């Protein structure tokens, strides 16, 4: 639900240990897919590697519905809370 999505977006900021870059990109990609939906931008160029990594994570989810990305985002945050603590 929307209230669960809001709770998860808050709780993920409070993990006691920083998740891996892969976990952080799962969170970023699904957050975008659950809100904007399919990627609507061009991949960052030049030396913006942080931007390219985020873009690639969101691009891989093209086709996923907002509702399914939201559910996966919430589930991942709950997984991260159990893994790292809050
Ligand atoms: Cl890193
Ligand atoms: Cl589904
Ligand atoms: Pb579905
Ligand atoms: Zn907070």
Tab-separated table of C-alpha atoms and ligand atoms in Angstrom:
chain	number	residue	atom	x	y	z
A	1	UNK	CA	0.000	0.000	0.000
A	2	UNK	CA	0.964	3.673	-0.233
A	3	UNK	CA	1.281	3.974	3.559
A	4	UNK	CA	3.571	0.963	3.573
A	5	UNK	CA	5.677	2.511	0.795
A	6	UNK	CA	6.031	5.738	2.799
A	7	UNK	CA	7.010	3.774	5.932
A	8	UNK	CA	9.596	1.788	4.034
A	9	UNK	CA	11.114	4.900	2.440
A	10	UNK	CA	11.570	6.284	5.917
A	11	UNK	CA	12.815	3.170	7.587
A	12	UNK	CA	15.443	2.383	4.939
A	13	UNK	CA	17.201	5.623	5.961
A	14	UNK	CA	17.658	4.278	9.472
A	15	UNK	CA	19.452	1.004	8.829
A	16	UNK	CA	22.216	0.568	11.330
A	17	UNK	CA	24.723	-0.608	8.766
A	18	UNK	CA	25.069	0.661	5.241
A	19	UNK	CA	23.707	-1.892	2.739
A	20	UNK	CA	25.799	-3.085	-0.182
A	21	UNK	CA	25.875	-0.987	-3.359
A	22	UNK	CA	23.751	-3.666	-5.028
A	23	UNK	CA	21.124	-3.413	-2.253
A	24	UNK	CA	21.139	0.323	-2.468
A	25	UNK	CA	20.581	0.157	-6.207
A	26	UNK	CA	17.703	-2.322	-5.802
A	27	UNK	CA	16.132	0.265	-3.481
A	28	UNK	CA	16.830	3.179	-5.831
A	29	UNK	CA	15.596	1.405	-8.957
A	30	UNK	CA	12.427	0.184	-7.417
A	31	UNK	CA	11.671	3.512	-5.795
A	32	UNK	CA	11.786	5.154	-9.218
A	33	UNK	CA	9.831	2.385	-10.871
A	34	UNK	CA	7.108	2.552	-8.192
A	35	UNK	CA	6.711	6.345	-8.639
A	36	UNK	CA	7.697	7.593	-12.091
A	37	UNK	CA	7.330	4.184	-13.662
A	38	UNK	CA	9.351	3.289	-16.766
A	39	UNK	CA	12.610	5.131	-17.134
A	40	UNK	CA	12.219	8.322	-19.078
A	41	UNK	CA	15.738	9.700	-19.237
A	42	UNK	CA	18.965	9.121	-21.117
A	43	UNK	CA	21.883	7.376	-19.401
A	44	UNK	CA	24.294	9.916	-17.856
A	45	UNK	CA	27.409	10.266	-19.891
A	46	UNK	CA	30.992	11.263	-19.335
A	47	UNK	CA	32.374	10.347	-15.909
A	48	UNK	CA	29.154	10.313	-13.897
A	49	UNK	CA	29.556	6.744	-12.667
A	50	UNK	CA	27.162	7.125	-9.714
A	51	UNK	CA	24.548	8.370	-12.206
A	52	UNK	CA	25.216	5.555	-14.658
A	53	UNK	CA	24.866	2.933	-11.892
A	54	UNK	CA	21.528	4.390	-10.732
A	55	UNK	CA	20.265	4.716	-14.310
A	56	UNK	CA	21.228	1.131	-15.139
A	57	UNK	CA	19.399	-0.194	-12.072
A	58	UNK	CA	16.212	1.697	-12.973
A	59	UNK	CA	16.467	0.828	-16.671
A	60	UNK	CA	16.537	-2.922	-15.924
A	61	UNK	CA	13.061	-2.659	-14.430
A	62	UNK	CA	11.407	-1.275	-17.550
A	63	UNK	CA	8.039	-2.948	-18.020
A	64	UNK	CA	7.457	-3.525	-14.305
A	65	UNK	CA	4.193	-2.118	-13.006
A	66	UNK	CA	4.215	0.583	-10.331
A	67	UNK	CA	2.282	-1.657	-7.978
A	68	UNK	CA	4.700	-4.540	-8.410
A	69	UNK	CA	7.798	-2.293	-7.999
A	70	UNK	CA	6.227	-0.825	-4.806
A	71	UNK	CA	5.579	-4.225	-3.324
A	72	UNK	CA	9.149	-5.346	-4.107
A	73	UNK	CA	10.586	-2.150	-2.645
A	74	UNK	CA	8.668	-2.613	0.634
A	75	UNK	CA	9.657	-6.249	0.836
A	76	UNK	CA	13.326	-5.409	0.301
A	77	UNK	CA	13.289	-2.773	2.999
A	78	UNK	CA	11.803	-5.312	5.421
A	79	UNK	CA	14.557	-7.726	4.385
A	80	UNK	CA	17.190	-5.058	5.003
A	81	UNK	CA	15.753	-4.150	8.431
A	82	UNK	CA	16.131	-7.826	9.513
A	83	UNK	CA	19.581	-8.017	8.031
A	84	UNK	CA	21.021	-4.745	9.413
A	85	UNK	CA	18.783	-3.608	12.173
A	86	UNK	CA	16.948	-0.397	12.710
B	1	LIG	CL1	30.456	1.777	-2.400
B	2	LIG	CL1	2.633	-9.135	-10.396
B	3	LIG	PB1	1.484	-7.907	-11.113
B	4	LIG	ZN1	14.357	9.636	9.675
